[PDB]
Short mmCIF file of C-alpha atoms in Angstrom, two decimals:
data_model
loop_
_atom_site.label_atom_id
_atom_site.label_comp_id
_atom_site.label_asym_id
_atom_site.label_seq_id
_atom_site.Cartn_x
_atom_site.Cartn_y
_atom_site.Cartn_z
CA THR H 170 11.72 -8.35 -98.55
CA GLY H 171 12.09 -11.81 -95.45
CA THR H 172 11.31 -10.55 -92.39
CA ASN H 173 12.67 -12.54 -89.62
CA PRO H 174 10.40 -14.29 -87.40
CA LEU H 175 13.21 -14.54 -84.82
CA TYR H 176 14.08 -10.88 -84.61
CA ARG H 177 14.23 -9.72 -80.99
CA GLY H 178 15.44 -6.08 -80.33
CA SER H 179 16.89 -4.00 -77.38
CA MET H 180 18.68 -6.54 -75.87
CA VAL H 181 22.05 -6.26 -73.54
CA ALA H 182 23.41 -9.21 -73.14
CA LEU H 183 26.89 -9.30 -74.02
CA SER H 184 28.16 -12.09 -77.34
CA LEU H 185 31.46 -13.10 -76.25
CA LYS H 186 34.53 -15.80 -77.63
CA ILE H 187 35.17 -17.88 -75.07
CA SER H 188 38.74 -18.99 -75.89
CA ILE H 189 39.86 -22.87 -74.20
CA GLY H 190 42.83 -23.85 -76.38
CA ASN H 191 42.50 -23.60 -80.36
CA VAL H 192 38.43 -24.42 -79.29
CA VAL H 193 36.71 -20.79 -80.29
CA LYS H 194 32.90 -20.67 -79.04
CA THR H 195 30.11 -17.46 -78.43
CA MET H 196 29.16 -17.25 -75.67
CA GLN H 197 25.92 -14.79 -74.14
CA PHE H 198 26.27 -12.68 -70.63
CA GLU H 199 23.91 -10.94 -68.94
CA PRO H 200 26.10 -7.74 -68.43
CA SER H 201 26.19 -8.14 -64.64
CA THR H 202 27.11 -11.67 -64.96
CA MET H 203 30.03 -11.94 -62.05
CA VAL H 204 33.22 -13.30 -63.08
CA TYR H 205 32.73 -16.03 -61.21
CA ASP H 206 29.54 -16.92 -62.70
CA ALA H 207 30.65 -16.56 -66.38
CA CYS H 208 33.03 -19.65 -65.37
CA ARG H 209 30.53 -21.41 -64.41
CA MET H 210 28.26 -21.49 -66.75
CA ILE H 211 32.02 -21.90 -69.44
CA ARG H 212 32.01 -25.23 -67.70
CA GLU H 213 28.67 -26.79 -67.81
CA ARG H 214 29.29 -25.68 -71.60
CA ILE H 215 32.55 -26.73 -73.30
CA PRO H 216 34.25 -30.30 -73.34
CA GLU H 217 37.64 -28.90 -72.89
CA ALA H 218 36.41 -26.37 -69.81
CA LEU H 219 37.47 -29.49 -67.97
CA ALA H 220 40.55 -29.90 -67.94
CA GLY H 221 41.10 -29.51 -64.66
CA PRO H 222 39.66 -27.92 -61.60
CA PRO H 223 38.01 -24.81 -61.21
CA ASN H 224 40.10 -22.97 -59.30
CA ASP H 225 43.06 -23.74 -61.73
CA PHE H 226 41.16 -22.01 -64.70
CA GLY H 227 40.41 -18.04 -64.18
CA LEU H 228 39.65 -16.06 -67.60
CA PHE H 229 41.93 -13.52 -68.75
CA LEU H 230 42.08 -10.70 -71.05
CA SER H 231 44.93 -10.50 -73.19
CA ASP H 232 46.83 -7.78 -75.42
CA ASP H 233 49.78 -7.15 -77.73
CA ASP H 234 51.65 -5.98 -75.38
CA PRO H 235 51.77 -9.56 -72.95
CA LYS H 236 51.71 -7.41 -69.59
CA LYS H 237 48.41 -6.25 -70.45
CA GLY H 238 46.96 -8.48 -70.02
CA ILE H 239 44.77 -8.88 -66.95
CA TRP H 240 43.05 -11.45 -65.17
CA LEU H 241 39.32 -10.95 -64.21
CA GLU H 242 38.40 -10.74 -60.35
CA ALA H 243 36.14 -13.47 -59.47
CA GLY H 244 33.95 -10.79 -57.57
CA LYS H 245 33.49 -8.18 -60.38
CA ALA H 246 31.13 -8.29 -63.06
CA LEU H 247 31.65 -8.49 -66.88
CA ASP H 248 30.86 -5.06 -67.22
CA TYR H 249 33.59 -3.63 -65.09
CA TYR H 250 35.81 -4.49 -67.90
CA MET H 251 34.10 -3.11 -70.27
CA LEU H 252 33.63 -5.63 -72.38
CA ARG H 253 31.92 -5.32 -75.71
CA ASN H 254 30.30 -7.59 -79.01
CA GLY H 255 33.15 -9.95 -80.04
CA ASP H 256 35.71 -9.37 -77.17
CA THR H 257 38.00 -12.80 -76.58
CA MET H 258 37.73 -13.99 -73.16
CA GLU H 259 40.35 -17.05 -72.60
CA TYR H 260 39.16 -19.82 -69.92
CA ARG H 261 43.40 -20.67 -69.80
CA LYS H 262 45.17 -22.07 -66.70
CA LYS H 263 46.74 -20.17 -64.36
CA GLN H 264 48.92 -22.18 -63.51
CA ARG H 265 52.61 -21.24 -64.89
CA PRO H 266 56.11 -23.18 -64.68
CA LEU H 267 59.09 -21.09 -62.68
CA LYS H 268 62.31 -21.25 -62.69
CA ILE H 269 63.82 -20.02 -59.89
CA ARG H 270 67.61 -19.85 -57.66
CA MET H 271 66.81 -20.97 -54.19
CA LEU H 272 68.57 -20.18 -51.07
CA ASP H 273 71.26 -22.27 -50.70
CA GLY H 274 72.56 -21.56 -55.62
CA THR H 275 70.79 -24.50 -57.20
CA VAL H 276 67.55 -23.73 -58.92
CA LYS H 277 64.65 -25.72 -59.03
CA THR H 278 61.22 -25.76 -61.11
CA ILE H 279 57.57 -24.91 -59.14
CA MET H 280 54.05 -23.77 -60.05
CA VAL H 281 52.33 -20.18 -59.58
CA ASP H 282 49.96 -18.73 -60.07
CA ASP H 283 50.08 -15.95 -62.66
CA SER H 284 47.27 -14.03 -61.45
CA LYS H 285 49.00 -13.74 -57.96
CA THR H 286 50.96 -10.48 -56.99
CA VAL H 287 54.74 -11.09 -55.82
CA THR H 288 53.57 -11.19 -52.41
CA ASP H 289 51.60 -13.70 -53.13
CA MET H 290 53.54 -15.45 -54.66
CA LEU H 291 56.75 -15.64 -52.25
CA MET H 292 54.15 -17.23 -49.25
CA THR H 293 53.67 -20.51 -51.04
CA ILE H 294 57.14 -20.45 -52.70
CA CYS H 295 58.23 -20.33 -49.12
CA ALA H 296 56.15 -22.01 -47.52
CA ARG H 297 57.44 -25.04 -50.38
CA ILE H 298 60.71 -24.46 -47.96
CA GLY H 299 59.15 -24.68 -44.67
CA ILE H 300 60.69 -20.62 -44.36
CA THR H 301 58.09 -18.72 -41.38
CA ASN H 302 59.93 -15.30 -41.57
CA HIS H 303 58.35 -15.30 -45.35
CA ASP H 304 57.94 -11.58 -45.52
CA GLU H 305 61.97 -10.84 -44.77
CA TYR H 306 62.37 -12.51 -48.06
CA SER H 307 61.72 -10.97 -51.95
CA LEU H 308 63.18 -11.86 -55.88
CA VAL H 309 65.16 -10.87 -57.55
CA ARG H 310 65.56 -11.09 -61.49
CA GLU H 311 69.30 -12.51 -63.02
CA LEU H 312 69.39 -5.21 -57.23
CA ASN H 313 66.74 -5.71 -58.94
CA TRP H 314 63.68 -6.20 -56.22
CA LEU H 315 60.68 -6.75 -57.64
CA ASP H 316 57.56 -5.19 -57.11
CA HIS H 317 56.06 -6.44 -54.69
CA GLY H 318 52.65 -5.16 -54.95
CA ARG H 319 52.60 -6.59 -59.12
CA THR H 320 51.93 -9.25 -60.88
CA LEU H 321 55.04 -11.00 -62.53
CA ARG H 322 53.14 -10.47 -65.80
CA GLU H 323 53.35 -6.65 -65.45
CA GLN H 324 56.30 -6.39 -64.78
CA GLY H 325 57.59 -7.56 -68.14
CA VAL H 326 59.00 -10.83 -66.36
CA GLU H 327 59.25 -13.64 -68.41
CA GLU H 328 58.14 -17.33 -68.18
CA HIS H 329 61.89 -18.47 -69.19
CA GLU H 330 63.83 -15.67 -66.86
CA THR H 331 65.53 -17.64 -64.02
CA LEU H 332 64.63 -15.41 -60.91
CA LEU H 333 66.73 -15.32 -57.87
CA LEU H 334 65.15 -15.68 -53.48
CA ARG H 335 67.19 -13.49 -51.49
CA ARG H 336 66.78 -12.20 -48.08
CA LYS H 337 65.55 -8.16 -48.35
CA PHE H 338 64.55 -7.01 -44.71
CA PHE H 339 67.87 -8.63 -42.04
CA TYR H 340 65.13 -8.26 -39.08
CA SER H 341 65.14 -11.13 -37.41
CA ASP H 342 68.33 -13.80 -36.65
CA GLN H 343 68.10 -17.03 -35.11
CA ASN H 344 71.29 -18.36 -33.93
CA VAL H 345 74.02 -20.14 -36.10
CA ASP H 346 75.01 -23.98 -34.76
CA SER H 347 75.95 -26.32 -36.83
CA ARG H 348 73.15 -28.88 -35.09
CA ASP H 349 71.20 -27.97 -38.89
CA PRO H 350 74.30 -28.55 -41.18
CA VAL H 351 71.48 -28.29 -43.87
CA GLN H 352 70.20 -24.34 -42.14
CA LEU H 353 74.35 -23.49 -41.71
CA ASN H 354 74.66 -23.96 -45.26
CA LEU H 355 72.33 -21.37 -45.94
CA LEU H 356 73.60 -19.03 -43.77
CA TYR H 357 76.35 -19.60 -45.00
CA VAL H 358 75.63 -18.88 -48.73
CA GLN H 359 73.49 -16.24 -48.14
CA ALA H 360 76.33 -13.91 -46.47
CA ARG H 361 79.06 -15.35 -48.87
CA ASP H 362 76.88 -14.48 -52.06
CA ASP H 363 76.26 -11.07 -50.39
CA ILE H 364 79.69 -10.35 -49.80
CA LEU H 365 80.57 -11.59 -52.69
CA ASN H 366 78.14 -9.63 -55.25
CA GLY H 367 79.49 -6.55 -52.71
CA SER H 368 75.49 -5.80 -50.84
CA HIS H 369 77.47 -6.18 -48.12
CA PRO H 370 80.63 -4.01 -48.50
CA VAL H 371 83.71 -5.04 -46.25
CA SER H 372 87.36 -3.97 -46.44
CA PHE H 373 89.74 -5.49 -48.01
CA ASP H 374 91.28 -7.85 -44.72
CA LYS H 375 87.97 -8.68 -43.64
CA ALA H 376 87.22 -9.95 -47.66
CA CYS H 377 90.72 -11.64 -47.49
CA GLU H 378 89.38 -13.53 -44.61
CA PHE H 379 86.47 -14.62 -45.74
CA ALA H 380 87.97 -16.03 -48.66
CA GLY H 381 90.30 -18.02 -46.26
CA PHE H 382 87.76 -19.70 -44.94
CA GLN H 383 85.76 -19.69 -48.36
CA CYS H 384 89.29 -22.32 -49.48
CA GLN H 385 88.64 -23.57 -46.24
CA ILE H 386 85.58 -24.76 -47.07
CA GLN H 387 85.32 -25.69 -50.67
CA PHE H 388 88.77 -27.44 -50.38
CA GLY H 389 89.53 -28.45 -47.05
CA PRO H 390 92.60 -27.92 -45.39
CA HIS H 391 95.53 -25.79 -47.23
CA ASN H 392 98.38 -27.75 -49.12
CA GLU H 393 100.99 -24.98 -49.83
CA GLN H 394 101.55 -27.97 -53.01
CA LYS H 395 98.13 -27.34 -54.80
CA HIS H 396 97.07 -24.48 -53.99
CA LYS H 397 99.97 -21.88 -55.23
CA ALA H 398 100.25 -18.14 -56.98
CA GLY H 399 97.56 -18.48 -60.28
CA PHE H 400 95.63 -21.41 -58.55
CA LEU H 401 92.72 -19.60 -57.58
CA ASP H 402 90.13 -17.75 -60.01
CA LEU H 403 89.60 -14.76 -57.46
CA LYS H 404 86.44 -12.45 -59.20
CA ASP H 405 84.71 -16.33 -57.55
CA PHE H 406 86.42 -15.82 -53.58
CA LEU H 407 86.75 -11.75 -53.62
CA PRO H 408 83.76 -8.99 -54.04
CA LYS H 409 84.53 -6.95 -57.33
CA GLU H 410 86.59 -3.54 -56.15
CA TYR H 411 88.87 -6.03 -54.91
CA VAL H 412 89.72 -8.78 -57.57
CA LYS H 413 92.40 -6.14 -59.61
CA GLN H 414 94.00 -6.06 -55.79
CA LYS H 415 96.95 -9.14 -55.46
CA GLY H 416 95.11 -10.41 -52.45
CA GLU H 417 96.19 -13.92 -53.40
CA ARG H 418 98.47 -14.48 -50.85
CA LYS H 419 96.64 -12.90 -47.98
CA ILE H 420 93.90 -15.26 -48.59
CA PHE H 421 96.02 -18.34 -49.55
CA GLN H 422 97.66 -17.14 -45.44
CA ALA H 423 94.13 -16.77 -43.69
CA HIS H 424 93.33 -20.15 -45.75
CA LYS H 425 96.39 -21.57 -44.05
CA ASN H 426 95.99 -20.39 -39.98
CA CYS H 427 92.22 -22.71 -40.85
CA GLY H 428 94.30 -25.60 -39.90
CA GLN H 429 92.44 -28.69 -40.12
CA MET H 430 89.08 -26.66 -38.89
CA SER H 431 86.07 -28.78 -40.07
CA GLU H 432 83.93 -27.59 -42.49
CA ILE H 433 81.42 -27.02 -40.99
CA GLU H 434 83.49 -25.40 -38.35
CA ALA H 435 84.92 -22.57 -41.35
CA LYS H 436 80.84 -21.80 -41.98
CA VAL H 437 80.04 -21.04 -38.15
CA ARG H 438 83.34 -19.10 -38.06
CA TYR H 439 82.73 -17.62 -41.76
CA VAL H 440 78.94 -16.50 -40.86
CA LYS H 441 80.00 -14.86 -37.34
CA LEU H 442 82.35 -13.27 -38.77
CA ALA H 443 79.68 -11.03 -40.92
CA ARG H 444 77.76 -10.94 -38.45
CA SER H 445 79.64 -8.96 -36.14
CA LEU H 446 80.85 -6.72 -38.59
CA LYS H 447 79.46 -3.31 -37.83
CA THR H 448 77.83 -3.18 -41.88
CA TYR H 449 76.12 -6.19 -41.37
CA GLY H 450 72.68 -6.35 -42.40
CA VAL H 451 72.40 -2.62 -43.17
CA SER H 452 71.22 -1.79 -46.79
CA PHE H 453 73.19 0.63 -49.11
CA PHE H 454 72.27 3.19 -51.40
CA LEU H 455 74.55 5.47 -53.41
CA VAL H 456 73.18 8.90 -53.31
CA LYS H 457 74.16 12.78 -53.59
CA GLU H 458 74.25 15.28 -51.18
CA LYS H 459 73.99 18.80 -51.67
CA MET H 460 76.84 19.93 -48.91
CA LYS H 461 75.90 23.63 -46.83
CA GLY H 462 77.76 26.16 -49.94
CA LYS H 463 79.29 23.90 -51.87
CA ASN H 464 77.44 23.26 -55.66
CA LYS H 465 78.86 20.11 -56.66
CA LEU H 466 76.93 17.39 -54.69
CA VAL H 467 79.35 14.95 -52.63
CA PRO H 468 78.22 11.29 -53.22
CA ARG H 469 77.38 9.51 -50.12
CA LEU H 470 76.42 6.02 -48.69
CA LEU H 471 72.48 5.50 -46.99
CA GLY H 472 72.24 3.13 -44.69
CA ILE H 473 69.12 1.21 -43.81
CA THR H 474 68.82 -1.31 -41.45
CA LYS H 475 65.28 -2.24 -39.49
CA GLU H 476 65.90 -0.10 -36.29
CA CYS H 477 67.54 3.29 -38.21
CA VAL H 478 68.07 5.52 -41.09
CA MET H 479 71.79 6.23 -41.60
CA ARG H 480 73.98 8.40 -43.88
CA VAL H 481 77.74 7.24 -44.11
CA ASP H 482 80.90 8.49 -45.82
CA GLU H 483 81.75 6.34 -49.62
CA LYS H 484 84.61 5.10 -49.09
CA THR H 485 85.48 4.27 -44.70
CA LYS H 486 82.18 3.12 -43.96
CA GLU H 487 82.11 5.03 -41.14
CA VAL H 488 78.66 6.57 -39.86
CA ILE H 489 78.45 10.88 -39.71
CA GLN H 490 74.47 10.93 -38.74
CA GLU H 491 71.62 8.05 -37.45
CA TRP H 492 67.34 9.36 -37.83
CA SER H 493 65.72 6.06 -36.14
CA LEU H 494 62.81 5.22 -38.04
CA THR H 495 60.68 5.96 -35.43
CA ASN H 496 62.33 9.49 -35.87
CA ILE H 497 61.14 9.75 -39.68
CA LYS H 498 58.15 11.59 -40.13
CA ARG H 499 57.82 10.93 -43.91
CA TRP H 500 59.13 9.88 -46.92
CA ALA H 501 58.91 10.52 -50.41
CA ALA H 502 60.59 9.31 -53.70
CA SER H 503 60.81 10.13 -57.46
CA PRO H 504 63.04 8.71 -60.12
CA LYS H 505 65.36 11.77 -59.31
CA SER H 506 65.54 11.98 -55.35
CA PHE H 507 63.92 11.24 -52.47
CA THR H 508 63.54 12.92 -49.29
CA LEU H 509 62.78 12.36 -45.59
CA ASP H 510 60.71 14.69 -43.25
CA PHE H 511 61.82 13.80 -40.00
CA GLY H 512 59.47 16.36 -38.17
CA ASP H 513 60.52 18.31 -34.75
CA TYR H 514 63.58 15.71 -34.54
CA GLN H 515 65.74 18.05 -37.60
CA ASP H 516 64.87 21.61 -38.88
CA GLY H 517 64.44 20.91 -42.91
CA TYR H 518 64.67 17.70 -44.37
CA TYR H 519 67.02 15.87 -45.88
CA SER H 520 66.71 14.73 -49.69
CA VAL H 521 69.17 13.53 -51.78
CA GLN H 522 69.60 12.92 -55.41
CA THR H 523 69.57 9.03 -56.65
CA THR H 524 68.28 6.98 -58.98
CA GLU H 525 66.45 4.63 -56.37
CA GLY H 526 64.26 6.46 -54.94
CA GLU H 527 61.76 3.98 -54.89
CA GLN H 528 63.46 1.31 -53.77
CA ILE H 529 64.77 2.75 -50.72
CA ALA H 530 61.25 3.73 -49.84
CA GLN H 531 60.20 0.12 -49.92
CA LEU H 532 62.97 -0.54 -47.75
CA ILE H 533 61.46 1.68 -45.62
CA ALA H 534 57.99 0.83 -45.63
CA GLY H 535 58.83 -2.91 -45.92
CA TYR H 536 60.91 -2.52 -42.08
CA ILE H 537 57.71 -0.69 -40.65
CA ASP H 538 55.02 -3.03 -41.93
CA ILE H 539 56.60 -5.38 -40.42
CA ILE H 540 58.05 -4.15 -37.18
CA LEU H 541 53.94 -3.16 -37.07
CA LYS H 542 52.86 -6.98 -38.15
CA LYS H 543 55.35 -7.77 -34.91
CA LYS H 544 53.27 -5.88 -31.65
CA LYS H 545 50.15 -6.69 -33.27
CA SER H 546 50.93 -9.98 -32.94
CA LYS H 547 52.41 -9.50 -29.24
#
């Protein structure tokens, strides 16, 4: 029998495998070591850890489910993370390329910090394109709003996916003028995409008026020789609800009525016509109501704005009822329902079936948060 002179009993240090690319290396850390010091010890001991500046790297605990991989917070200690001897920590690059469709419709590639929530990520994305009201904007997956409070990774967003930048809160609108035609085009593309994808619902007549301006903008003035029956792919000029109607003649009439209107003037009229509609700036959700003495549930539209919540008939789009946001005491969402407590401003709660309760609640809470930030600055 040999006895080991190097034997040291009752040691507490964690022994961890530090992975950096193809390099692995076992290192010893005191369980109470702050994450930021562990990063510093790794930088002083493995040459490959010098591939980039410190703020570009962090410690990452992977998982078979990539969505459950986590980035360690700098101000925590290792023992918080319930690590055991033989565990692996990656010293891993935080930056990753994100394909994002911008507000004009183009797809750019930008670098995002994989450890940031979507909220902090939207700040640096908006900064990159000169947007101050970054609180009005969000990302949709290719409306599937991403969760602002969570990272992309933990929402199952993959790094090959292209995400869409889109305005979510309609709080503040600047005037529309030909002075900045780049800005004018941004206002136009967003107004148009919302009409065409149906998140701004409009009448058949209005939808055809819009298409007329859109024809003027994409083709120039109407030429009866070329812009004849069958020319238009209607799914590119009409919301889906109206494609199976024979609107090509009406679109072409409104196109003719633009005469020699310039591209810029047609964008200004398009934006203004959209802003002039009672439906502008309203986010609509489909809910099912319980009518007094009616076992069946009547589908209804719930409208959210920066000022109010409204009950709206599903077809005509008329307002049956309206409560100001200041009149709402509480709200609650579930996977099957959404509920509004109005305090003394009503007897009973307003409770409705819907799958989008969590999304309704986040829209209402976001408008409130925007309002609270404006008063705090005033």
